[PDB]
Amino acid sequence: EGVQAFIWQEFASALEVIPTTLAENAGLNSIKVVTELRSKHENGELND
Amino acid sequence: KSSGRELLERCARTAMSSKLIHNNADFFVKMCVDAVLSLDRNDLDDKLIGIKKIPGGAMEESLFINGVAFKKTFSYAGFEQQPKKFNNPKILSLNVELEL
């Protein structure tokens, strides 16, 4: 908790630019992909 | 044997797509449907639906009235002394020019 919490939060948001572009270039709906991945990850899947 | 009022609302909903109105179509579709129904079915005219390009205000603040407005005109000294609200006034029209 502190002033650097928002900086680390935006650091995590900007790091997901790669898979957002793969869904954009492939014609897929990106947000879907990013959120799905984020979750399939909550079930213990390290690689998705 | 459906109702006639709902027919105009149903077909006008398609026209309000691909515009800035499609979310505010619930309120403005009633305006044009009630506006065209006031016209005569035999003689439907395109010049009686004039819309004035008045600035200011949000589009949802508009109001539909069966009457007609005109925009105040030149107004020689005399204006802002008469009552600006009447109960049952009588409207007169004159190609008459009343000047000395």
Place this chain on the structure above:
Amino acid sequence: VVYGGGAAEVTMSLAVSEEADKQRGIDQYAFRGFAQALDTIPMTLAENSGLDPIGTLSTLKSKQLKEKISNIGVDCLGYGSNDMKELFVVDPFIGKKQQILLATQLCRMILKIDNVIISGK
């Protein structure tokens, strides 16, 4: 009448955030953009008044979520109390409403433009 000065904006903001949570899909992210867009006004008042936007924005979001009283905003003159009942500030409802209506109705027109042709004079 209403009570502006970030108060209105902060209120509106938490409202939108809760509703945003009750919304799932492309829509939620939007609602979130509308929430963060309303926060720029009290952050601008905090920026011009010199106060910290972190402590100011965090205090309004945390306090307004706890208490239901919705007349606390950004104190720019440097008073010790942020409650606007004592500071003598009042705004109209028709004035604060038109900021959102004319803004959200214009930006629909700004976003629809794809082809932009400018004839040089």
Place this chain on the structure above:
Amino acid sequence: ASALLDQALELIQKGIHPIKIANGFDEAAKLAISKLEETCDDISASNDELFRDFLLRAAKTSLGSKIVSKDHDRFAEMAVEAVINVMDKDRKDVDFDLIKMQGRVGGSISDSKLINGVILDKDFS
């Protein structure tokens, strides 16, 4: 309006179409304005004495964000006393066209005093 555009520009990058974003903002705007109407307080039930004071609370707000705020108590009475003379005290209308406004370049701003009449810029015959 620029804040909605700045937050919308990133949404498009994330992948969203512009029109969805617009629809969304609009819905959100409705929610917000509404919710504001729910928590809105009305001051019409009070009498004219307390309602007289509420005009100063709002007149001082808009005059506070200008250079006129050196004496906000003094010049706010000018903006309130002018409307007392035009209000009908029941189903009130402002009648804005009657209220004229003219300023002369001269003296200081502290010497400004409200009058009831018409200001002429011409001499006698």
Place this chain on the structure above:
Amino acid sequence: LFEEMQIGSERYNLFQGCPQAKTCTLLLRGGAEQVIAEVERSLHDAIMIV
């Protein structure tokens, strides 16, 4: 009924309560000047359907 109200820095005289009137009017507002003209021609197309 008849009432004049400054709809936006413009004074306009409005007739009201005319059920026998075979005409109509529309006072469309807008943030900008093209929002008015765009919504003007939009409802003109909507009127053209009905």
Place this chain on the structure above:
Amino acid sequence: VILTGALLGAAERLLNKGIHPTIIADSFQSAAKRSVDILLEMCHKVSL
């Protein structure tokens, strides 16, 4: 390059937030160092 543009877009709004750039810059260095600590954990070894 695209991650650099994403972090600059993340740093664009943080400049308006009112946080010093050096605090924002040092935060990415600590976050990048912790990102390497995450990469070494999930690093799957391979044989020659």
